[PDB]
Design a binder for this molecule. Structure first.
Ligand SMILES: CCCCCCCCCCCCCCCCCC(=O)OC[C@H](COP(=O)([O-])OCC[N+](C)(C)C)OC(=O)CCCCCCCCCCCCCCCCC
Ligand SMILES: CCCCCCCCCCCCCCCCCC(=O)OC[C@H](COP(=O)(O)OCCN)OC(=O)CCCCCCCCCCCCCCCCC
Ligand SMILES: CCCCCCCCCCCCCCCCCC(=O)OC[C@H](COP(=O)(O)OCCN)OC(=O)CCCCCCCCCCCCCCCCC
Ligand SMILES: CCCCCCCCCCCCCCCCCC(=O)OC[C@H](COP(=O)(O)OCCN)OC(=O)CCCCCCCCCCCCCCCCC
Ligand SMILES: CCCCCCCCCCCCO[C@@H]1O[C@H](CO)[C@@H](O[C@H]2O[C@H](CO)[C@@H](O)[C@H](O)[C@H]2O)[C@H](O)[C@H]1O
Ligand SMILES: CCCCCCCCCCCCO[C@@H]1O[C@H](CO)[C@@H](O[C@H]2O[C@H](CO)[C@@H](O)[C@H](O)[C@H]2O)[C@H](O)[C@H]1O
Ligand SMILES: CCCCCCCCCCCCO[C@@H]1O[C@H](CO)[C@@H](O[C@H]2O[C@H](CO)[C@@H](O)[C@H](O)[C@H]2O)[C@H](O)[C@H]1O
Ligand SMILES: CCCCCCCCCCCCO[C@@H]1O[C@H](CO)[C@@H](O[C@H]2O[C@H](CO)[C@@H](O)[C@H](O)[C@H]2O)[C@H](O)[C@H]1O
Lengths: 494, 670, 64, 100, 48, 72, 38, 73, 81
């Protein structure tokens, strides 16, 4: 069997073991948690084995298994240098997601672990499948377990929040389905190798673009459309919020390198000015309203909207630099947003039971270790050099500017306004007076669990910010096949 | 060695910051101080090694960003301009650490303070030793973080929090423009290594230099607090005094100027950027000389005096005489840091009070401070044969030397800046030392006269001078403030000197003014600042002491009540920015949050659709009555419409109008 | 017309001088007398000037 | 010249970087065409990297005299900077263009 | 799968990174007709 | 005079010790240990970057010209 | 007021032999003064 | 879930948050709200889009030297 | 007067007024680990610094004592006649 199926089967084996141990024993919930965490370690172990054996400049799909037994819907699993790092991020994030929420679930612990083990399978799949109809199948199988992850383990406004993400993500995904169905009917299949050969007529590509973009604007999400995220990324449990922002948000970032860039190039080129206008607006309106947010977890959720706009504008630049910067900023947001939900929804909400920023002040005086990590995370969210977030923004903004110079200049306002929301939140909670008077008793500082998941996540952000070539070497050759263009003395050689 | 200069300040910071528990307060102080001391000798050596032998040093360690055409190395280049910058940076860092062993002695948190000091030194080293513009930007941002961490060191003071947000976001404004300008260089030349940018600049499209130059100018003035983005330098005086000495008035403000001296082999190829730098420099010298004359705080005056000298240096850059501004830059860090350290001593000697109105006498109590501070004021005003005379007054005469209108205008303008500089420097030395005592009596009670009987052992506090760690810097910094101008005036000014012959400071032969400034200027304008300084000084002393009634007639005239409050309020700039710019953004954010996100976006969307559809379906289900008689009529009605539709050959659109019109009537109740 | 308050600027400014009689005269006597007299006030405004001036004249006569 | 490394044989294109006379339903030939265009564009941009590295040394070697001694390197680097960009193959795969 | 280069150019247009063979000589003409300036870039090399 | 150093690290009061919750076991040996073993192995992984390949050829093309010196 | 009364230049632009055209980047570069108008 | 530490929950601030979370239930279409809802959603993005349309491929700084023009069209 | 502070707070930089008794031993140990890291960085520079100009045989230039590129030049230059 292929080694890419081993990534899928392990979480499946782990769900089986959680449901069949109580039959060998009133077993403790501690042993439920250990099995799920070990089984996400193994996926990470395997995924690094896949990465050692990867070939950084091969234009054929790798780790493929020859099926030669065709059906109507067959799983085809290939790994490519444009998808490898999305897989690695998934497998590094899911253990922290489990450890972060280790004592906070308290009830329905089996069901909680079985959903996350299910989620890791489906999100691993969406990066590994070699069809665009297969891509859609897994891109939307994550929807039922997320409706239940929010309504069982979510906060007060959990019911409306779970309806919002499900219904918005269902609606937006059904316009992508109509366009995928058109592509398949014209071409006969949705297997990548046969689609990338095929070139659609301009008018068809103009109508496939309207349909793949409706979906991804719903799933970025852009400003006019993000009302599900400000509910779902907040009412959800801590572990739900980590997966939703780090991994689920990137399903459409990686889905533009497959669905738009190679098969609808003329449409992408001629409509970019519409994308850039939308992207510029969500860099401003989201930045303006991230200043006035009184919910700490909601402030982090709103930050993701402004970040996602920068990478969306990068993936539409037709430049090798904005394309790699978009993947780097997708990865960068993955580690940093994870840490700030760990700070907001998993530490202050553990100790105070509230998310209102009015009750917090001067937390440096009694939690110095929280303050140190909270400040480093806050500076990466502000796009400060030495973090992977700065590199992703620099390259994303450069390509946005080289393609359409006016929108990149309005996108670069982020540099100013991301810094203004990030420092203002940090100053209000850690600094900004003395330990607040609403704290009747003292609050303990970080536990050894809270320290080491923040430390792990922060370490990824810095070392990748110093040596981004750890991720750039795989991207260069594979990214070099989604650029559309020619130069006069370099093309059509004889 | 060269890569060891970079690493030592970094290593000491790590021990003091994440290991302050293990070494303690004294252990941190020794390691932080000694490690920075060692780096300073290594850089004194590097000055003779690189500059005095014309041997630039290159090192490259590994890649930072490796995309096609974009390869930025974690690399360093030591040249003539580099080693000039390090000497003030490393000495002033070395001495301010030693100063701080006694200034912060009572503070609870010394391991954190001394760590931030080492961290700040590392970032200036990175800023002036990078190969490319992008690694320059690591220190540029790094010193920005270090400034925020030190203006907000006492994070329990809300005032300190406000001033650190102001330092951060005003500097992040120039960061946006500096990044935009850095995107122009990559777009135009593919790379942003210094060697590439300068080897290629003479042939680049003139209009592209005017894009890069105006971006590197807007970013530079944010850090150098020029007339527009300067609001933060005054507010930085919230952080402790030794931070103001190193970061806010001797090293960080310099990064704005260093960007232009470094980018000289490029921005000489645009007369626009040079004629823009010229005026931006001249406006700030007068803009900040008037404000400082009207402040009641020692540090707000000395901060506004820093701003005036910075405006002089950018004046020199626009004048295209880069080596002159590199001279004023190195010189200023000596007599400026001396004032803060000197004025730091007077604040500590009393009660940590800072107001001029409550300081007086204190010349006898603080004998060393007054002399050293007057050592500094004599060079700050560029009294003849001081370290300032060989730099500050050469810009004035080289301004008139460039026989153009703009040159003459900025001479006149900067000359007025000089006269108001001499004026507030009298205000500092007279009020604090030479004035009638103005503060409380405990500042002054000695032990000679016996004012006590049963408590004579304690309760005097007669404003004592500081200890060894406080005075040894001041005396050393003062020894610089005297001899340093004359000793290096050939390295930098000369007449045909070849120190910067590695193209570190490229001057285009179509701009040079040294020969004219040496010979063309008449003796009157060559000497004029000396006359004004010697004239208004005795006038100012006379008004402040001999005739102490004229100023109050001015303050209590209505005409003077308004001119006074216009300058004390800093040209009302803060008032206008805070009300029109800052508070506009907060209300825009509120309008988007309330009216749209929680409003029309939800009314024209999920909440509107929810409200409409539920009403729609309640009405339709009000039809279903379980009356067979009514159901039969509905089936016949639905039968007739089918026959009408598919026998009249009605337009399909006619049907949808009916269907859509029906749905709306079910939306309406009653 | 004068205000209902008797205050006026002209009389306010004219009184801006050392009062002849003061109920606080003794309490404030210290700030202007003794160590704080004008001679001692500016006795040391130029610390090294006296020592240097005589020393420099020694240098001048040394050449001749 | 520099001996061709052993690692420089498994990745050396065997085909001219074109699509003329390339059957698209033959996947191996089509993929090798694609790979052959990608590597030419990449060698061209790495040729600029190396000339720029020489220019840098010439700049620091000559100092003030860089404006006269490094112009041949300047000329080569400025030619590669407009001739070479990595533009991909997708345009060339989907369009046929001829000299006529 | 492939189209005549002229066909694609009509919908998207030459430019925006689509520089078909001969774009510079045509651009020379386009700029001369509009701005009225002869294009003559500098050699940027003191010898030949 | 300086005070003694203090503090409950992980909130552990000076009497007792940190009680292991469960995560510590696999997170320290499996999670981190996998990254050290990954880092150790990543050193010996061959370099299949497009640049290492494009540099070797592009050097040989420049070597034909006077731009780069040829050892032979 | 400065514009109304400010001095004329007193020094002629310094003549360089050949314009130093070879020391500033060839003909494709800005060269110093050489037997031109004033 | 877990019991949190004791907080002097402010009756005033709790109802302020309860006001914000429930705010959208009371939004109405007035002449004022339409004006803001029209400027932010239509005018400002339409204005940005128009500039993005008219400047597309208008300028390129790549390799351009003196004697050449930044404008590409 | 020293500020009152809570004694349960753990901080990597000491917190309030924190000096251990054994601080001289801890400080000394940190000095060597610094001095060892700096020594590795110095041997790196010596072998990777790049100069295009070479120092004169007689003028003060202590880099001639540790940098390979220079030292190899003067060793080669110490071979003539
Ligand atoms: C590198 C040196 C880091 C020094 C960190 C010092 C420390 O631990 O302070 C904790 C301190 C407390 O140390 P402390 O020992 O003074 O504790 C004082 C007592 N309290 C705070 C409990 C009242 O916590 C903070 O002040 C919170 C802010 C942390 C700031 C982090 C500094 C470094 C950030 C990275 C900068 C990189 C810039 C790149 C561009
Ligand atoms: C605040 C900063 C603190 C930094 C601490 C860590 C410093 C690490 C220093 C590494 C020095 C390497 C020594 C050998 C020289 C380079 C040899 C080589 O080929 O390395 C490959 C790679 C990139 O280096 P290279 O391609 O040579 O870059 C050109 C300029 N030398 O270089 C590499 O192998 C880099 C891989 C490690 C990543 C370093 C950063 C991780 C954090
Ligand atoms: C992104 C941030 C952008 C910041 C502003 C960048 C401005 C770049 C302008 C580039 C387009 C210039 C077009 C042009 O050719 O106009 C000619 C003129 C330059 O001509 P001139 O300098 O007088 O002499 C010929 C030089 N060889 O150029 C001009 O006269 C244009 C007007 C002066 C532009 C420079 C000053 C800009 C000040 C902006 C202040 C905003 C408030
Ligand atoms: C471009 C064109 C615009 C710019 C140029 C013109 C700018 C405005 C010129 C008119 C106003 C100048 C100052 C007038 C006097 C004044 O208000 O000085 C206030 C200043 C502070 O005094 P304070 O410390 O408050 O109390 C008295 C202490 N002796 O007083 C002192 O510092 C006392 C010593 C100086 C007093 C005389 C100053 C004369 C200045 C001429
Ligand atoms: C497409 C469908 C949607 C996709 C998402 C699927 C989500 C599946 C959730 C996991 C399956 C159900 O999870 C199930 O939860 C019930 C809750 O009563 C648990 O049942 C147990 O709960 C607690 C646990 O302490 C016991 O005290 C109780 O006696 C027992 O009923 C089961 O042990 C667990 O297996
Ligand atoms: C482009 C437009 C957007 C596309 C589609 C978006 C549709 C999302 C709208 C879903 C509306 C919310 O859906 C509905 O919300 C209410 C709460 O408000 C929920 O109601 C629930 O929450 C309330 C909270 O007091 C409780 O009484 C109880 O838990 C339950 O009744 C309903 O279970 C759900 O049916
Ligand atoms: C950035 C733009 C985002 C667009 C998202 C997608 C929009 C979806 C289109 C339909 C949305 C629903 O549109 C909404 O319809 C409902 C009825 O159902 C109206 O709801 C209300 O109408 C009027 C007020 O106008 C009320 O008196 C009435 O009681 C109520 O039904 C809203 O006024 C209308 O705005
Ligand atoms: C960081 C991104 C940078 C790229 C985006 C901005 C690029 C701006 C480029 C502006 C210059 C482009 O090219 C420029 O076109 C403008 C058009 O008015 C011309 O500008 C000139 O036009 C007319 C003639 O028509 C002149 O009389 C007038 O003095 C001047 O405005 C310049 O002579 C030419 O050099």
């Amino acid at each position: 069997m292929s080694l890419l199926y081993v990534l899928l089967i392990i979480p499946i084996i782990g769900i089986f073991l959680i449901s069949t141990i109580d039959s060998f024993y009133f077993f403790n919930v501690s042993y439920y948690k250990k099995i799920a965490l070990i089984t996400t370690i193994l996926n990470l172990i395997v995924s690094l084995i896949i990465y050692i054996l990867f070939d950084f400049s091969n234009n054929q799909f790798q780790f493929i298994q020859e099926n030669l037994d065709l059906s109507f819907y067959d799983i085809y699993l290939g790994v490519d240098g444009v998808s490898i790092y999305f897989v690695l991020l998934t497998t590094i994030i899911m253990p922290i997601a489990l450890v972060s929420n280790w004592n906070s679930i308290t009830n329905n612990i089996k069901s909680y672990l079985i959903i996350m083990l299910l989620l890791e399978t489906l999100l691993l799949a969406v990066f590994l499948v070699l069809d665009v109809l297969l891509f859609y199948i897994f891109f939307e199988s994550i929807l039922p377990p997320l409706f239940i992850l929010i309504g069982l383990f979510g906060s007060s406004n959990k019911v409306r929040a779970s309806f919002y993400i499900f219904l918005y993500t269902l609606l937006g995904s059904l316009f992508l389905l109509l366009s995928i169905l058109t592509m398949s009917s014209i071409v006969g299949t949705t297997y990548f190798d046969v689609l990338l050969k095929s070139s659609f007529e301009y008018t068809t590509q103009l109508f496939l673009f309207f349909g793949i973009f409706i979906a991804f604007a719903v799933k970025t999400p852009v400003w006019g459309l993000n009302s599900w995220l400000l509910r779902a990324h907040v009412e959800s449990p801590l572990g739900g919020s980590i997966v939703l922002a780090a991994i689920v948000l990137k399903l459409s970032l990686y889905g533009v390198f497959r669905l738009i860039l190679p098969i609808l190039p003329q449409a992408s080129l001629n409509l970019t000015y519409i994308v850039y206008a939308i992207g510029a607006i969500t860099v401003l309106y989201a930045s303006f309203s991230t200043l006035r947010t009184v919910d700490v977890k909601e402030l982090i959720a709103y930050s993701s909207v402004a970040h996602a706009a920068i990478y969306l504008m990068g993936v539409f630049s037709n430049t090798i630099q904005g394309l790699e910067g978009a993947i780097l900023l997708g990865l960068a947001h993955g580690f940093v947003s994870s840490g700030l939900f760990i700070c907001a929804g998993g530490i202050l909400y553990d100790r105070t039971g509230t998310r209102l920023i009015y009750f917090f002040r001067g937390l440096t005086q009694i939690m110095p270790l929280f303050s140190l990590f909270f400040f480093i995370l806050c500076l990466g969210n502000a796009g400060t050099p030495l973090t992977l977030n700065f590199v992703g923004e620099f390259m994303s903004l450069y390509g946005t500017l080289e393609r359409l110079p006016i929108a990149g200049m309005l996108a670069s306002t982020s540099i100013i306004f991301s810094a203004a929301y990030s420092i203002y939140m940090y100053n209000r909670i850690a600094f900004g007076g003395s330990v607040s008077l609403y704290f009747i008793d003292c609050f303990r500082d970080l536990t050894k669990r809270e320290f080491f998941i923040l430390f792990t996540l922060v370490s990824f952000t810095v070392i990748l910010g110093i040596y981004p070539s750890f991720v750039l070497d795989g991207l260069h050759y594979n990214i070099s096949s989604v650029v559309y263009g020619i130069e006069p003395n370099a093309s059509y050689l004889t | 060695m060269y890569l060891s200069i970079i690493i030592l300040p970094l290593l000491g910071s790590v021990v003091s910051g994440f290991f302050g528990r293990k070494v303690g307060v004294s252990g941190a102080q020794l390691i932080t101080c000694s490690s920075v001391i060692i780096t300073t000798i290594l850089s004194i050596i590097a000055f003779f090694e690189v500059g005095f032998n014309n041997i630039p040093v290159t090192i490259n360690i590994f890649r930072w960003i490796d995309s096609e055409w974009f390869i930025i190395n974690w690399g360093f280049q030591y040249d003539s301009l580099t080693v000039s910058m390090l000497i003030p940076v490393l000495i002033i860092s070395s001495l301010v650490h030693i100063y701080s062993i006694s200034y912060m002695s009572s503070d609870p948190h010394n391991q954190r303070f001394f760590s931030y000091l080492s961290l700040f030194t590392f970032m200036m080293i990175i800023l002036v030793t990078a190969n490319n513009y992008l690694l320059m930007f690591v220190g540029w941002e790094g010193v920005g973080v270090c400034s925020y961490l030190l203006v907000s060191f006492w994070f329990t003071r809300i005032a300190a929090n406000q001033s650190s947000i102001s330092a951060f976001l005003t500097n992040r404004v120039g960061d946006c423009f500096l990044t935009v300008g850095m995107f122009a260089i990559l777009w135009s030349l593919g790379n942003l290594d210094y060697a590439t940018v300068f080897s290629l600049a003479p042939y680049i499209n003139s209009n592209v230099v005017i894009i890069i130059g105006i971006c590197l100018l807007i970013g530079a003035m944010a850090k150098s607090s020029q007339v527009g983005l300067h609001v933060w330098l005054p507010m930085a005086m919230e952080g402790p005094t030794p931070v103001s000495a190193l970061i806010h008035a001797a090293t960080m403000v310099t990064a704005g100027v260093y960007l232009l001296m470094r980018s000289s082999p490029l921005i000489e190829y645009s007369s626009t950027v040079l004629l823009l730098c010229l005026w931006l420099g001249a406006i700030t010298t007068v803009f900040s000389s008037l404000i400082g004359l009207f402040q009641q705080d020692i540090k707000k005056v000395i901060a506004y005096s820093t701003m005036s000298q910075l405006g002089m240096m950018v004046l020199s850059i626009g004048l295209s005489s880069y080596n002159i501004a590199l001279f004023h830059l190195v010189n200023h860090a000596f007599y400026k840091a001396l004032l803060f350290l000197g004025a730091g001593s007077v604040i500590h000697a009393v009660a940590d009070n800072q107001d001029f109105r409550k300081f007086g006498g204190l010349i006898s109590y603080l004998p060393l401070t007054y002399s050293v501070m007057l050592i500094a004021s004599l060079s700050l005003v560029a009294f003849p044969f001081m370290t300032g005379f060989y730099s500050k007054d050469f810009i004035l005469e080289s301004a008139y030397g460039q026989f153009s209108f703009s040159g003459v205008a900025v001479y006149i303008i900067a000359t007025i800046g000089a006269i108001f500089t001499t004026l507030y420097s009298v205000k500092v030395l007279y009020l604090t030392f030479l004035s009638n005592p103005n503060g409380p009596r405990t500042y002054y009670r000695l032990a000679i006269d016996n004012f006590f009987s049963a408590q004579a052992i304690k309760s005097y506090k007669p404003a004592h001078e500081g200890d060894f760690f406080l005075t040894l810097p001041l005396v050393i910094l003062a020894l610089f403030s005297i001899f340093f101008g004359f000793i290096t005036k050939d390295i930098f000014i000369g007449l045909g000197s070849n120190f910067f012959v590695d193209n570190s400071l490229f001057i285009h032969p179509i701009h040079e003014i040294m020969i004219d400034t040496e010979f063309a200027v008449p003796v009157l304008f060559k000497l004029l600042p000396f006359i004004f300084t010697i004239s208004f000084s005795v006038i100012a002393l006379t008004l402040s002491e001999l005739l102490s009634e004229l100023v109050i007639y001015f303050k209590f005239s209505r005409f003077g009540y308004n001119i006074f409050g216009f300058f004390n309020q800093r040209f009302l700039i803060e008032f206008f920015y805070n009300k029109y710019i800052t508070n506009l953004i907060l209300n825009l954010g509120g309008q988007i949050t309330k009216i749209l996100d929680k409003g029309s976006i939800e009314l024209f969307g999920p909440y509107g659709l929810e409200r409409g559809l539920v009403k729609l379906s309640k009405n339709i289900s009000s039809l279903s009555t379980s009356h067979v008689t009514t159901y039969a009529l509905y089936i016949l009605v639905g039968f007739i419409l089918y026959l009408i539709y598919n026998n009249l050959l009605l337009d399909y659109s006619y049907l949808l109008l009916i269907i859509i019109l029906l749905l709306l009537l079910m939306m309406i109740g009653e | 017309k004068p205000n209902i308050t008797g205050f006026d600027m002209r009389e306010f400014l004219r009184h801006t001088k050392t009062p002849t009689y003061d109920p606080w005269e003794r309490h404030e006597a210290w700030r202007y007398t003794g160590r704080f007299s004008r001679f001692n006030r500016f006795k040391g405004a130029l610390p090294g000037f006296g020592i240097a001036t005589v020393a420099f004249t020694a240098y001048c006569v040394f050449e001749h | 010249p520099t001996p061709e490394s052993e690692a420089f044989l498994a990745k050396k294109p065997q085909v001219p970087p074109t699509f003329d006379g390339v059957d698209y339903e033959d996947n191996k030939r089509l993929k090798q065409a694609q790979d052959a265009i990608i590597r030419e564009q990449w060698v061209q941009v790495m040729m600029g990297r190396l000339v720029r590295e020489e220019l840098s040394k010439c700049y620091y070697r000559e100092g003030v005299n860089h404006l006269e001694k490094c112009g041949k390197l300047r000329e080569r680097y400025l030619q590669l900077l407009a001739n070479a960009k990595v533009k991909g193959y997708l345009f060339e795969q989907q369009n046929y263009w001829s000299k006529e | 799968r492939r189209r005549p280069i002229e066909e694609t150019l009509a919908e998207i247009g030459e430019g925006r990174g689509i520089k078909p063979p001969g774009y510079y000589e045509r651009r020379a003409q386009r700029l001369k007709e509009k701005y009225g300036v002869d294009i003559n870039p500098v050699c940027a090399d003191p010898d030949q | 005079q300086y005070d003694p150093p203090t503090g409950w690290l992980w909130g552990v009061r000076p009497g007792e010790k940190y009680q292991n919750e469960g995560w510590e076991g696999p997170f320290f040996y499996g999670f981190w240990g996998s990254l050290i073993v990954f880092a150790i192995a990543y050193a010996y992984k061959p370099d299949t970057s497009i640049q290492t390949w494009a540099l070797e050829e592009a050097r040989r093309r420049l070597e034909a010209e006077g731009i780069l010196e040829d050892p032979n | 007021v400065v514009k109304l009364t400010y001095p004329d230049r007193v020094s002629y632009p310094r003549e360089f032999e050949g314009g130093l055209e070879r020391e500033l980047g060839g003909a494709g570069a800005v060269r110093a003064f050489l037997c031109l108008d004033d | 879930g877990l019991q949190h530490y004791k907080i002097a929950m402010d009756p005033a601030l709790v109802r302020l948050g309860s006001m914000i979370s429930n705010r959208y239930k009371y939004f109405r279409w007035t002449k004022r709200t339409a004006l803001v809802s029209f400027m932010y959603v239509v005018v400002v993005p339409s204005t940005i889009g128009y500039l993005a349309y008219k400047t597309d491929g208008l300028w390129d700084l790549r390799a351009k030297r003196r004697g050449d023009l930044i404008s590409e069209r | 007067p020293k500020i009152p502070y809570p004694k349960h707070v753990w901080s990597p930089a000491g917190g309030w007024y924190a000096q251990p008794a054994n601080w001289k031993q801890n400080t000394a140990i940190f000095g060597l680990v610094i001095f060892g890291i700096t020594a590795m960085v110095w041997k790196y520079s010596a072998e990777h610094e790049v100069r295009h100009k070479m120092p004169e045989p007689d003028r003060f230039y202590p880099s001639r004592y540790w940098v390979k590129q220079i030292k190899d030049y003067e060793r080669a230059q110490k071979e003539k006649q």
